Specification:
- It is classed as viral protein.
- Keywords: Fusion protein, Spike glycoprotein, covid-19, RBD, NTD, Viral protein.
- The structure is cut from a larger assembly and holds two copies of chain A.
- By secondary structure, chain A is mostly beta strands.
- Chain A is built from no helices and four strands.
- The structure holds 2-acetamido-2-deoxy-beta-D-glucopyranose.
Amino acid sequence: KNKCVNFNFNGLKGTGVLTESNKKFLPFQQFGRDIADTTDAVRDPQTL
Amino acid sequence: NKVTLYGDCLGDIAARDLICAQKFKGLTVLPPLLTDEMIAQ
Ligand SMILES: *[C@@H]1O[C@H](CO)[C@@H](O)[C@H](O)[C@H]1NC(C)=O
């Protein structure tokens, strides 16, 4: 966390800093999408 | 007053700003050469 990483969360490739998120996801929700439809938050699979 | 115009936008994940999202999609706003103090002078 707080570092640039080539991330592969549940098969979603990306390059970005990852930080703790205030946003709360409902159990069905696993990913968060912004206006541009680019994932802005991901729930970690190993730790929810 | 009548007309309303990285570390800031990194900590702006709790709030939502259209300037931070425009910066993160590569669309930045350059400042003018003359400030408001100089247009006023
Ligand atoms: C996955 O394993 C880690 C390491 O033991 C543990 O901390 C975490 O709670 C586990 N998650 C689930 C959903 O079992």
